Amino acid sequence: IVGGYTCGANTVPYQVSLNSGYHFCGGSLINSQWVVSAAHCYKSGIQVRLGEDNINVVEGNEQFISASKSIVHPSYNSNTLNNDIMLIKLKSAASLNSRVASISLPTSCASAGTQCLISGWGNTKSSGTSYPDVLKCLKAPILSDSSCKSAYPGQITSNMFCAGYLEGGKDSCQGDSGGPVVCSGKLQGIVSWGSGCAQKNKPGVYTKVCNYVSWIKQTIASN
Ligand SMILES: [Ca+2]
Protein backbone atom coordinates (compact mmCIF):
# COMPACT_ATOMS: atom_id res chain seq x y z
CA ILE A 1 0.00 0.00 0.00
CA VAL A 2 1.46 3.40 -1.12
CA GLY A 3 0.32 6.58 0.71
CA GLY A 4 -1.84 4.67 3.25
CA TYR A 5 -1.81 4.59 7.07
CA THR A 6 -0.99 1.99 9.72
CA CYS A 7 -4.38 0.21 10.23
CA GLY A 8 -3.71 -0.75 13.85
CA ALA A 9 -3.37 -4.31 15.24
CA ASN A 10 -6.40 -6.52 14.35
CA THR A 11 -8.53 -3.57 13.10
CA VAL A 12 -9.03 -5.51 9.78
CA PRO A 13 -9.95 -8.90 11.31
CA TYR A 14 -10.78 -10.58 7.92
CA GLN A 15 -7.33 -9.78 6.48
CA VAL A 16 -5.18 -12.90 5.95
CA SER A 17 -1.53 -13.32 4.98
CA LEU A 18 -0.74 -16.22 2.61
CA ASN A 19 2.63 -17.67 3.62
CA SER A 20 4.89 -20.12 1.76
CA GLY A 21 7.92 -19.51 4.06
CA TYR A 22 7.26 -15.76 3.62
CA HIS A 23 4.28 -13.46 3.03
CA PHE A 24 3.47 -13.44 -0.71
CA CYS A 25 -0.21 -12.46 -0.94
CA GLY A 26 -3.22 -11.23 0.99
CA GLY A 27 -6.67 -12.78 1.22
CA SER A 28 -10.02 -12.40 3.00
CA LEU A 29 -11.66 -14.80 5.44
CA ILE A 30 -15.25 -15.28 4.20
CA ASN A 31 -16.22 -17.99 6.75
CA SER A 32 -14.44 -20.13 9.38
CA GLN A 33 -12.93 -22.46 6.71
CA TRP A 34 -12.55 -20.49 3.43
CA VAL A 35 -10.37 -17.65 2.20
CA VAL A 36 -10.78 -15.69 -1.03
CA SER A 37 -7.68 -14.37 -2.80
CA ALA A 38 -6.43 -13.64 -6.36
CA ALA A 39 -5.90 -16.56 -8.79
CA HIS A 40 -2.46 -14.97 -9.61
CA CYS A 41 -1.55 -15.77 -5.97
CA TYR A 42 -1.96 -19.53 -6.68
CA LYS A 43 0.80 -21.80 -5.42
CA SER A 44 0.95 -25.17 -3.53
CA GLY A 45 2.19 -25.31 0.11
CA ILE A 46 0.13 -22.31 1.37
CA GLN A 47 -0.21 -21.61 5.09
CA VAL A 48 -2.96 -19.14 5.90
CA ARG A 49 -2.03 -16.71 8.74
CA LEU A 50 -5.00 -15.07 10.41
CA GLY A 51 -4.98 -12.48 13.20
CA GLU A 52 -1.74 -10.90 11.89
CA ASP A 53 -0.50 -7.38 12.43
CA ASN A 54 3.32 -7.62 12.44
CA ILE A 55 3.96 -10.58 10.04
CA ASN A 56 7.56 -10.94 11.39
CA VAL A 57 6.71 -11.13 15.12
CA VAL A 58 4.42 -13.53 17.04
CA GLU A 59 2.16 -11.04 18.89
CA GLY A 60 -0.36 -13.53 20.33
CA ASN A 61 -3.57 -13.28 18.19
CA GLU A 62 -2.36 -15.39 15.24
CA GLN A 63 -3.89 -18.58 13.87
CA PHE A 64 -1.66 -20.49 11.40
CA ILE A 65 -3.70 -23.05 9.39
CA SER A 66 -2.58 -25.00 6.29
CA ALA A 67 -4.65 -24.91 3.09
CA SER A 68 -6.28 -28.31 2.28
CA LYS A 69 -7.45 -27.30 -1.20
CA SER A 70 -7.08 -24.36 -3.60
CA ILE A 71 -9.65 -23.67 -6.35
CA VAL A 72 -8.70 -21.17 -9.06
CA HIS A 73 -11.67 -19.76 -10.98
CA PRO A 74 -12.35 -22.08 -13.90
CA SER A 75 -12.11 -19.11 -16.41
CA TYR A 76 -9.02 -17.45 -14.89
CA ASN A 77 -6.83 -16.08 -17.73
CA SER A 78 -3.25 -15.39 -16.48
CA ASN A 79 -2.55 -13.17 -19.57
CA THR A 80 -5.51 -10.71 -19.16
CA LEU A 81 -6.06 -11.36 -15.35
CA ASN A 82 -9.75 -11.81 -16.15
CA ASN A 83 -11.50 -13.76 -13.35
CA ASP A 84 -8.55 -13.16 -10.96
CA ILE A 85 -10.13 -14.98 -7.99
CA MET A 86 -9.32 -18.18 -6.06
CA LEU A 87 -10.80 -19.99 -3.04
CA ILE A 88 -8.65 -21.62 -0.39
CA LYS A 89 -10.09 -24.17 2.05
CA LEU A 90 -8.42 -24.36 5.52
CA LYS A 91 -7.46 -27.82 6.93
CA SER A 92 -9.44 -26.85 10.05
CA ALA A 93 -11.84 -24.06 10.96
CA ALA A 94 -10.46 -20.76 12.30
CA SER A 95 -11.57 -19.81 15.84
CA LEU A 96 -13.63 -16.59 15.22
CA ASN A 97 -13.32 -13.66 17.75
CA SER A 98 -13.20 -9.77 17.58
CA ARG A 99 -9.65 -10.00 16.02
CA VAL A 100 -10.32 -12.91 13.57
CA ALA A 101 -13.65 -12.44 11.76
CA SER A 102 -15.21 -13.26 8.36
CA ILE A 103 -16.20 -10.46 5.92
CA SER A 104 -19.64 -10.75 4.27
CA LEU A 105 -20.00 -11.30 0.54
CA PRO A 106 -21.94 -8.57 -1.28
CA THR A 107 -25.61 -8.89 -2.32
CA SER A 108 -25.15 -5.88 -4.73
CA CYS A 109 -22.30 -4.46 -6.82
CA ALA A 110 -20.86 -1.24 -5.36
CA SER A 111 -21.28 1.96 -7.45
CA ALA A 112 -18.60 4.43 -8.57
CA GLY A 113 -18.01 7.00 -5.76
CA THR A 114 -18.35 4.34 -2.99
CA GLN A 115 -15.51 4.75 -0.45
CA CYS A 116 -13.67 1.46 0.31
CA LEU A 117 -10.86 0.20 2.60
CA ILE A 118 -7.97 -1.60 0.94
CA SER A 119 -5.41 -3.30 3.18
CA GLY A 120 -2.18 -5.26 2.87
CA TRP A 121 1.52 -5.77 3.60
CA GLY A 122 2.64 -4.78 0.09
CA ASN A 123 5.33 -2.34 -1.02
CA THR A 124 4.81 1.23 0.31
CA LYS A 125 6.94 2.95 -2.43
CA SER A 126 5.92 3.93 -6.05
CA SER A 127 9.69 3.95 -6.91
CA GLY A 128 12.03 1.47 -5.15
CA THR A 129 11.08 -1.02 -2.41
CA SER A 130 10.04 -0.83 1.28
CA TYR A 131 7.94 -3.69 2.69
CA PRO A 132 6.20 -2.94 6.00
CA ASP A 133 6.00 -5.52 8.79
CA VAL A 134 2.57 -4.18 9.99
CA LEU A 135 -0.76 -3.91 8.13
CA LYS A 136 -1.30 -0.78 5.96
CA CYS A 137 -4.72 0.63 5.07
CA LEU A 138 -5.99 2.95 2.35
CA LYS A 139 -9.40 4.54 1.89
CA ALA A 140 -10.13 4.92 -1.82
CA PRO A 141 -13.22 5.43 -3.98
CA ILE A 142 -14.44 3.14 -6.74
CA LEU A 143 -13.86 4.95 -10.08
CA SER A 144 -16.42 5.19 -12.92
CA ASP A 145 -16.17 2.29 -15.44
CA SER A 146 -15.50 5.06 -18.09
CA SER A 147 -12.45 6.53 -16.09
CA CYS A 148 -11.23 2.98 -15.59
CA LYS A 149 -11.47 2.12 -19.37
CA SER A 150 -9.86 5.50 -20.30
CA ALA A 151 -6.90 4.72 -17.97
CA TYR A 152 -6.42 1.16 -19.30
CA PRO A 153 -7.71 1.06 -22.90
CA GLY A 154 -8.66 -2.48 -23.98
CA GLN A 155 -7.73 -4.16 -20.63
CA ILE A 156 -10.76 -3.69 -18.36
CA THR A 157 -13.37 -6.46 -18.43
CA SER A 158 -16.83 -6.45 -16.78
CA ASN A 159 -15.10 -8.50 -13.94
CA MET A 160 -12.80 -5.60 -13.01
CA PHE A 161 -13.19 -2.18 -11.42
CA CYS A 162 -10.76 0.66 -10.74
CA ALA A 163 -10.39 2.24 -7.31
CA GLY A 164 -7.99 4.92 -6.17
CA TYR A 165 -6.83 8.33 -7.31
CA LEU A 166 -6.11 9.45 -10.88
CA GLU A 167 -3.65 12.08 -9.40
CA GLY A 168 -1.56 9.07 -8.14
CA GLY A 169 0.31 8.88 -4.81
CA LYS A 170 -2.17 6.42 -3.19
CA ASP A 171 -2.59 2.80 -4.38
CA SER A 172 -2.23 -0.89 -3.55
CA CYS A 173 1.06 -2.45 -4.75
CA GLN A 174 3.03 -5.74 -5.16
CA GLY A 175 2.43 -7.96 -2.09
CA ASP A 176 -1.08 -6.46 -1.52
CA SER A 177 -2.23 -8.89 -4.24
CA GLY A 178 -5.22 -11.06 -3.30
CA GLY A 179 -6.16 -8.71 -0.43
CA PRO A 180 -9.52 -7.14 0.30
CA VAL A 181 -11.40 -4.10 -0.91
CA VAL A 182 -14.25 -3.67 1.60
CA CYS A 183 -17.07 -1.12 1.05
CA SER A 184 -19.90 -0.72 3.60
CA GLY A 185 -18.78 -3.89 5.47
CA LYS A 186 -18.84 -6.15 2.33
CA LEU A 187 -16.04 -7.65 0.25
CA GLN A 188 -16.38 -5.81 -3.11
CA GLY A 189 -12.89 -6.31 -4.54
CA ILE A 190 -9.67 -8.33 -4.62
CA VAL A 191 -6.34 -6.54 -5.20
CA SER A 192 -5.54 -7.80 -8.74
CA TRP A 193 -3.25 -5.54 -10.86
CA GLY A 194 -2.16 -2.05 -11.97
CA SER A 195 0.53 -0.33 -14.04
CA GLY A 196 3.31 0.13 -11.45
CA CYS A 197 1.96 1.59 -8.15
CA ALA A 198 0.42 5.01 -7.36
CA GLN A 199 1.21 6.36 -10.88
CA LYS A 200 -0.74 9.31 -12.32
CA ASN A 201 -3.73 8.10 -14.48
CA LYS A 202 -3.01 4.44 -13.51
CA PRO A 203 -5.32 3.43 -10.62
CA GLY A 204 -5.54 -0.01 -9.05
CA VAL A 205 -7.59 -2.70 -10.81
CA TYR A 206 -9.64 -5.05 -8.57
CA THR A 207 -11.56 -8.27 -9.19
CA LYS A 208 -15.33 -7.45 -9.06
CA VAL A 209 -16.40 -9.93 -6.30
CA CYS A 210 -20.19 -9.24 -6.77
CA ASN A 211 -19.92 -11.14 -10.12
CA TYR A 212 -18.57 -14.31 -8.33
CA VAL A 213 -21.01 -14.75 -5.40
CA SER A 214 -22.99 -17.68 -6.96
CA TRP A 215 -19.65 -19.40 -7.91
CA ILE A 216 -18.26 -18.81 -4.36
CA LYS A 217 -21.41 -20.08 -2.63
CA GLN A 218 -21.90 -23.15 -4.86
CA THR A 219 -18.12 -24.00 -4.56
CA ILE A 220 -18.12 -23.73 -0.72
CA ALA A 221 -21.33 -25.85 -0.52
CA SER A 222 -19.74 -28.85 -2.40
CA ASN A 223 -16.08 -28.81 -1.18
CA1 LIG B 1 2.46 -11.75 13.83
Residue numbers in the entry: 24 to 246
Which lines from the publication concern this structure?
In this paper, we report the development of an in situ diffraction measurement system using crystallization plates at SPring-8, which is combined with compound dispensing using an acoustic liquid handler. In the experiment, we obtained small-wedge diffraction data from crystals of trypsin in complex with the compounds introduced by the acoustic liquid handler. The crystal structures of the complexes of seven compounds other than N-acetyl-5-hydroxytryptamine were obtained from the eight compounds soaked into trypsin crystals. The resolution of the crystal structures of these complexes was 1.38–1.77 Å.
The following compounds were used: benzamidine, 4-methoxybenzamidine, 4-bromobenzamidine, serotonin, 5-methoxytryptamine, 5-chlorotryptamine and tryptamine. In order to form ligand-bound trypsin crystals, the compounds in DMSO at a volume of 50 nl were introduced into a 500 nl crystallization drop and data were collected after overnight soaking. In situ diffraction measurements of trypsin crystals into which the compounds had been introduced by the acoustic liquid handler were carried out by collecting 10° data from each of 18–24 crystals, processing each wedge independently and merging the data. The results showed that the overall completeness of the data was 91.4–99.5%. The crystal structures of these complexes showed a high degree of similarity to the structures obtained from the data measured at room temperature, including the surrounding water molecules.
